[PDB]
Amino acid sequence: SFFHGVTVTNVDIGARTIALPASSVIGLCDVFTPGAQASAKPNVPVLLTSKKDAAAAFGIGSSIYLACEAIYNRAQAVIVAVGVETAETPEAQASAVIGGISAAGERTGLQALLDGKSRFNAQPRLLVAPGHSAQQAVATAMDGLAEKLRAIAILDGPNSTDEAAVAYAKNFGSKRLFMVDPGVQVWDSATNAARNAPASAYAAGLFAWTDAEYGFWSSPSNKEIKGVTGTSRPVEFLDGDETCRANLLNNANIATIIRDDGYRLWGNRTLSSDSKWAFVTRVRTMDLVMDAILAGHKWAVDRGITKTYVKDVTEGLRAFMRDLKNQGAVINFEVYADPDLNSASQLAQGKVYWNIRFTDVPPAENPNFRVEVTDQWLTEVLDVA
Amino acid sequence: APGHSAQQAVATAMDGLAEKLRAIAILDGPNSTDEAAVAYAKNFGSKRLFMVDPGVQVWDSATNAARNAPASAYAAGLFAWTDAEYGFWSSPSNKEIKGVTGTSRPVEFLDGDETCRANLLNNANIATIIRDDGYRLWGNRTLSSDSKWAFVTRVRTMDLVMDAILAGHKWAVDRGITKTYVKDVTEGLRAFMRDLKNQGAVINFEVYADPDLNSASQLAQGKVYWNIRFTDVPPAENPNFRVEVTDQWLTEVLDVA
Amino acid sequence: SFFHGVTVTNVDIGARTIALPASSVIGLCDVFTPGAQASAKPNVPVLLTSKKDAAAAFGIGSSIYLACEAIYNRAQAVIVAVGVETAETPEAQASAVIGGISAAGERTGLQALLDGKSRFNAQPRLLVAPGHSAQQAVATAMDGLAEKLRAIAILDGPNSTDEAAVAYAKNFGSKRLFMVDPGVQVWDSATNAARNAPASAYAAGLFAWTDAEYGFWSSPSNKEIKGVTGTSRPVEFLDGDETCRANLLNNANIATI
Amino acid sequence: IPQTLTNTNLFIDGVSFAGDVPSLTLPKLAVKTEQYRAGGMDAPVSIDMGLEAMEAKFSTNGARREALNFFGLADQSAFNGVFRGSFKGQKGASVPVVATLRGLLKEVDPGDWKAGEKAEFKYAVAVSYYKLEVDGREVYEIDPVNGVRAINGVDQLAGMRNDLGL
Amino acid sequence: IPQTLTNTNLFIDGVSFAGDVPSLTLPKLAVKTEQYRAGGMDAPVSIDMGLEAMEAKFSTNGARREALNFFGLADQSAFNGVFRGSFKGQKGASVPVVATLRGLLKEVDPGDWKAGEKAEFKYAVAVSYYKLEVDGREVYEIDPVNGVRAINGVDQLAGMRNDLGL
């Protein structure tokens, strides 16, 4: 039928969440139950642009959908979700999420995220696995994948205690891995009670928003995790070194969630044995800078080498690089065509080399407000005057 | 439907029609007793239905004697007056039924919960007529199984708000969809809606064009969607005057001073 | 049920205390008994904005509630209370109030106050532990915490005598620690007799009020402790140096009343 | 990062004026100030006293009908209209700037018809309501008959709304 | 859809001035507004308070007689005149814009006779009645001594006419 008029339809639609649209895509891997409505064959990476798609693709009461909402609430970003059918044991669950080649048909589990590009152009820059992450196995898989991807993998360590979290963090040191310990505690309106989330979803979501309204090269350190209320464990944070629970976790290279009712994130640091890659800002810059370069030098990867090929590229690089400098992304740079390598042999075999040494924006951290309550300006007032 | 309303059949017809209309259907239950009225009210739960039990007793000058009316007529009349000099969004709960004298059964009403006949009928979702010689109506509540639509104020607001919207967005129901069609309408809505807020009708609101539905397919087929979530004026009811007769301010006066 | 009218409810409500709203938050740690009504799991820092919340959260006849009232009577401030379940021995009581990490779940005792921020944004600027403070152990804990916080920790020394108070004060010298010796003596209307309070609660309360209607940078030195009557020991104060009991305690770095 | 305005278009009631509108003008949003000089200080300081009379103005140079037919219309604030304007930017992606403004048409000024010059009508809507958006993001929303001066969401009169009891 | 004004002609009493009239000017139809700021709101809003003094003006640069012979004429509103103006439009078909305006001639200003420059007389009829039509369709009809401000048919003073009892 086709009604001809203006249908006044009484229906509960609980408040537009609102969300600034972002770009940085998110590789989500969680669990769910393939029912009649949740139209999404378990190991098939689907694409999502809004909660409505998340619902139609995954049971409204699925862990997938919970993470999807945790992202959207912050920023309307493009997500690549993979519905790992709920397994039984923790071992089976972990294995089923990690996946692999297994079924000759396609790459299951997290490996399905490698189909993100070529399927929907949604090459995950931010890997996330809600809950399935306490397990050292899944985290190792996340790290390896994250490398084979150049994507910040956002872990959530053991929610319980801090000793476990620290002990867990000491197991890693892999550049890409960026952990968030305190499992967020958000008030689920549905059951009307404090739910318990794994935190990684909210971190990734806010990561996307930070890439947009601030820059991919700006840390998400001090940014406000939209939605949510408290955590599953009150995080302490004060000044003066001390055993401030925050200072502790942010000296084992872990990000926490501080201030009233899960106000904001806290920690630009990342799990890395190498001090040079201590800042996520460093890693993310070094990665996405090159994403912008390649998505722009696509023409340069074929074509009959001419006399001017080397120069076309070294200038094309100086264009994208310069633009990034203009909009803050970096601070100076230097591109040229490494001579001690460019040879007749390499050129006949297609290859050719260039250098792109540059500097990245150091995120201001640890402002040291030194203060002295004196009695210098005392006579200057009060006495007589 | 005066009198023709004790009959469960007519009331059911009134309800169905009332739905196919978005109109508050004012019933008058069995005039006799209260047990019958309550038993009768339990047969319904339909949002629109709004019952008035005590059959008004007005002094017909013609025959020179106390006539007996079905009450629904006087309720509807006062409903109209309340829409005008107060607002369509103001309940007729405490408003004075002009004309008339007593009822066909003295209605009790006091304070302290109790078995106050009024409190009884206004806990079976029925409006009564209280105070001297049919002074006024009494009961914003309506026959509804659903607690959200407990107040006639809620229903009437939710209905007449949209009457004002449609009688104003008449232009929006045809016309070649342009790039700016969605915006013309979402703003036109924010105009009427805002005006209603200004004159009290509601308290804040929120209009936008539900994205997860607006598509090329739906648009090619003419259709399109919007959300209009808003809040309605809660009618103040049950003021709880808590009072303590102390002896605090005793020395403050009397003794010496 | 939903009564439709105006309930005249006769109920004893003994005089609005009145209190200028303040901002400076107060980390309260006292004892109580978790019953059926006192809904507050012992080592869980709850937030309080009024006596009604204090009651519903702690037995009306609890030491927690007494301190809460001692604060409110002066100023309607935001309190972060931690109900240390009443222990037996003074040693067990002191240890249970000081707390620590102990239960892997959460930070017990006074350490629960460090959850004040991140829970309710109520980072205690004023630490207080009523009675549990004569004990040198609890006071040391208060000092350490107070440092890890930058919060004036308000102690109440041994209520009995002055020699003890002075001897006790000589054990400290920690910047943050601010002691109040004379245990206030307020007339509890409930039992109808002079109660005996630890004083620290009233000091913290007035501290908050002083921060508001005067400034956080104005001393509470000469400000009036609302509520209360005499002390548990008449404090002398005159002029001309002398052995004026006040001058004595305020030369051992102690505040009196 | 050079932006600058490239093209402009003007709506009145959905009807596009893609054609005659060589000039738009958004309402100059100004506060009332009142230079406060007072005890204890030399040099004034200036205070938020509320806004000034927002008036917007466009100027089609055609006998357009769809515009002329709102003048002095009994129902002040019936004239709606939307002032869209695309800012180019040297890096391509244009920023849509759009300013809906429900107001009262107020006046209409056809200048000197000279038999050899664009006649150029003129208009000056006394703006009542006014929402200016940039890149599909509310920057202003000024509503006088309601008190809703809201810079990008946050409502700066939310505090005076309470004190007035509105 | 570019319109623009091409040619112009001016009548006074049937007599065509097909010749000397290098400038016409229709009466700037303006409302009186009065920026209403009041309790409960910052920022004014503006109210229909009635129109402004409609004055129209043409300016033949010839000693034309037929125009000069209406100045200060005892019978104010004897001067009639019709200000026609053809708007071309890029697609050919021209839109006739015509504005009859029964009014009082008021003043006449012959500028600087310079023995080498179009003398250019000037005129400024204080318009009483005024009907502006577009494409043979009433857009305005403003009649003060009667209260008939009627945008294309609908009379916006039909409601105040009753309350005044006219």
DSSP B175-236: S---TTHHHHHHHHHHHHHHHHHHTTSEEEE--B--TTT--HHHHHTT----B--EEE----
Rounded-to-integer distance, Cα C83 and Cα B59, Å:
69
User: In chain C, which residues have their Cβ closer than 8 Å to the Cβ of B245?
Assistant: 10
Residues A286 and A330: beta-carbon distance below 8 Å: no
Closest CA to C204 of C73, C113, C71: C71
Instruction: List, as ranges, residues 47-66 from A with C-beta within 8 Å of B.
Output: 50-53
How many CB atoms are closer than 10 A to CB A193?
8
Give Cα E22 distance to the centre of its chain: 16
How many CB atoms are closer than 10 A to CB D111?
17
Determine the residue type at B6: A
Joined together, the tokens standing for residue A114 give 């490698």
| Chains A and B touching, counted as 3 or more CB pairs less than 8 Å apart | yes
Rounded-to-integer distance, Cα B12 and Cα B9, Å:
5
Residues C5 and B112: beta-carbon distance below 8 Å: no
D146–B181 CB contact, under 8 Å: no
Rounded-to-integer distance, Cα B110 and Cα A156, Å:
62
CA distance B170 to chain D (A): 14
User: Three-state DSSP class for A68?
Assistant: helix
Residues D22 and D10: beta-carbon distance below 8 Å: no
Residues D120 and D107: beta-carbon distance below 8 Å: no
| Contacts of A among chains (3+ CB pairs under 8 A) | B, C, D
Determine the residue type at B108: E
Closest CA to B138 of A153, E37, C3, C48: C3
Phi-psi group of B112: left, alpha or beta (phi > 0 → left; psi -120 to 50 → alpha; rest → beta):
left
A242–C118 CB contact, under 8 Å: no
User: In chain B, which residues have their Cβ closer than 8 Å to the Cβ of C13?
Assistant: 242, 244
Of B184, B194, B198, the CB nearest to D14: B184
E3–D72 CB contact, under 8 Å: no
User: In chain A, which residues have their Cβ closer than 8 Å to the Cβ of B158?
Assistant: 10
Closest CA to A96 of A79, A106, A105, A83: A83
Instruction: List helix spans (H) across B122-180.
Output: 152-166
Breaks (C-N over 2.5 A) in chain D follow: none
D107–E134 CB contact, under 8 Å: no
SS (H, E, C) chain D: CCCCEEEEEEECCCCECCCCCCCCCCCCCCECCCCCCCCCCCCCCCCCCCECCCECCCCCCCCCCCCHHHCCCCCCCCCCCEEEEEECCCCCCCEEEEEECCEECCEECCCCECCCCCCCCCECCEECCEEEEECCCEEEEECCCCCCCECCCCECCHHHHHHHCC
Give the determination technique. Answer: cryo-EM
Determine the residue type at C51: K
Residues A253 and A269: beta-carbon distance below 8 Å: yes
Rounded-to-integer distance, Cα B93 and Cα A94, Å:
62
Q: Nominal resolution in Å?
A: 3.5
Of D11, D143, D146, the CB nearest to B180: D11
Residues A182 and A158: beta-carbon distance below 8 Å: no
Please state the length of chain D.
Answer: 166
Joined together, the tokens standing for residue C125 give 């600027």
Please state the length of chain C.
Answer: 257
Give Cα A130 distance to the centre of its chain: 12
Rounded-to-integer distance, Cα B30 and Cα B35, Å:
9
Residues E62 and E114: beta-carbon distance below 8 Å: no
Please state the length of chain B.
Answer: 257
Q: Does B112 touch chain C (CB under 8 A)?
A: yes
Rounded-to-integer distance, Cα B84 and Cα B229, Å:
25
User: In chain D, which residues have their Cβ closer than 8 Å to the Cβ of E33?
Assistant: 106, 126
Distances (CA, A) of B255 to A141, B250, B251, B252: 87, 8, 6, 8
Of C4, C13, C14, the CB nearest to B238: C4
Distances (CA, A) of B96 to B50, B79, C7: 18, 10, 21
Of D18, D109, D119, the CB nearest to E5: D119
Distances (CA, A) of B216 to A78, B209, B221, B222, B226: 20, 14, 9, 10, 15
Output phi, psi for B151, to 5 deg: -100, 135
Phi-psi group of E17: left, alpha or beta (phi > 0 → left; psi -120 to 50 → alpha; rest → beta):
alpha
Q: Does C36 touch chain B (CB under 8 A)?
A: no
- Report chain C's C-alpha Rg in angstroms: 19
Joined together, the tokens standing for residue B226 give 């919007």
Which helix (H) or strand (E) element contains residue A144? helix A136-147
| Contacts of B among chains (3+ CB pairs under 8 A) | A, C, D
Breaks (C-N over 2.5 A) in chain E follow: none
- Report chain D's C-alpha Rg in angstroms: 19
Joined together, the tokens standing for residue E110 give 């012959």
Breaks (C-N over 2.5 A) in chain A follow: none
| Chains D and B touching, counted as 3 or more CB pairs less than 8 Å apart | yes
B194–D14 CB contact, under 8 Å: no
SS (H, E, C) chain C: CCCCCCCEEECCCCCCCCCEECCCCEEEEEEECCCCCCCCCCCCCEEECCHHHHHHHCCCCCHHHHHHHHHHCCEECCEEEEEEECCCCHHHHHHHHHCECCCCCCCEHHHHHHHHHHHCCCCCCEEECCCCCCCHHHHHHHHHHHHCCCCEEEECCCCCCCHHHHHHHCCCCCCCCEEECCCECCEECCCCEECCCCCHHHHHHHHHHHHHCCCCCCCCCCCCCCCCCCECCCCCCCCCCCCCHHHHHCCCCCECC
Which helix (H) or strand (E) element contains residue A143? helix A136-147
Q: Which residues pair with B227 in a beta bridge?
A: B208
Q: How many helices (H) and strands (E) does chain A have?
A: 11, 14
How many CB atoms are closer than 10 A to CB A39?
11
Closest CA to A258 of A293, A294, A230, A227: A230
User: Counting Cβ atoms within 10 Å, is residue A227 exposed (0-12), middle (13-18) or buried (19+)?
Assistant: buried
User: In chain C, which residues have their Cβ closer than 8 Å to the Cβ of B123?
Assistant: 1-3
Rounded-to-integer distance, Cα A333 and Cα A359, Å:
6
Rounded-to-integer distance, Cα A111 and Cα A138, Å:
12
Residues C124 and C116: beta-carbon distance below 8 Å: yes
User: In chain A, which residues have their Cβ closer than 8 Å to the Cβ of D1?
Assistant: 326-327
SS (H, E, C) chain E: CCCCEEEEEEECCCCECCCCCCCECCCCEEECCCCCCCCCCCCCCCCCCCECCCECCCCCCCCCCCCHHHCCCCCCCCCCCEEEEEECCCCCCCEEEEEECCEECCCECCCCCCCCCCCCCCECCEECCEEEEECCCEEEEECCCCCCCECCCCECCHHHHHHHCC
Rounded-to-integer distance, Cα A30 and Cα A54, Å:
13
Rounded-to-integer distance, Cα B120 and Cα B112, Å:
12
Close Cβ partners of E4 (under 8 Å, ≥ 6 residues apart): D20, D61, D62, D118, D119, E87, E88, E89
Residues A171 and A44: beta-carbon distance below 8 Å: no
Residues D127 and D103: beta-carbon distance below 8 Å: yes
CA distance E150 to chain D (A): 9
Q: Does B247 touch chain C (CB under 8 A)?
A: no
Determine the residue type at D14: G
How many CB atoms are closer than 10 A to CB B227?
18
A53–B206 CB contact, under 8 Å: no
Q: Between A and B, how many CB-CB pairs are < 8 A?
A: 26
Q: Where do we find the tokens 């180019």?
A: D88
Distances (CA, A) of A30 to A24, A68, A86: 19, 10, 9
What number of CA atoms fall less than 13 Å from residue B131's CA on the CB side? 11
Instruction: List helix spans (H) across A148-221.
Output: 163-169, 200-212
User: Counting Cβ atoms within 10 Å, is residue C242 exposed (0-12), middle (13-18) or buried (19+)?
Assistant: exposed
Residues A305 and A347: beta-carbon distance below 8 Å: yes
Q: Does A261 touch chain C (CB under 8 A)?
A: yes
Q: Does B122 touch chain C (CB under 8 A)?
A: yes
Q: What is the largest CA-CA distance in chain D?
A: 64
Rounded-to-integer distance, Cα A3 and Cα C103, Å:
64
| Chains A and E touching, counted as 3 or more CB pairs less than 8 Å apart | no
Distances (CA, A) of C216 to A369, C28, C209, C222, C223: 21, 19, 9, 14, 13
Q: How many helices (H) and strands (E) does chain B have?
A: 7, 9
Phi-psi group of B100: left, alpha or beta (phi > 0 → left; psi -120 to 50 → alpha; rest → beta):
left
User: In chain A, which residues have their Cβ closer than 8 Å to the Cβ of B221?
Assistant: 2
Q: Does B172 touch chain A (CB under 8 A)?
A: yes
Q: Does A326 touch chain B (CB under 8 A)?
A: no
Residues E85 and E97: beta-carbon distance below 8 Å: yes
User: Counting Cβ atoms within 10 Å, is residue A56 exposed (0-12), middle (13-18) or buried (19+)?
Assistant: middle
Q: Could you tell me whether strands A152-155 and C46-48 are parallel, antiparallel, or unpaired per DSSP bridges?
A: unpaired
D90: closest chain A residue by CA: A323
Close Cβ partners of A282 (under 8 Å, ≥ 6 residues apart): A276, A360
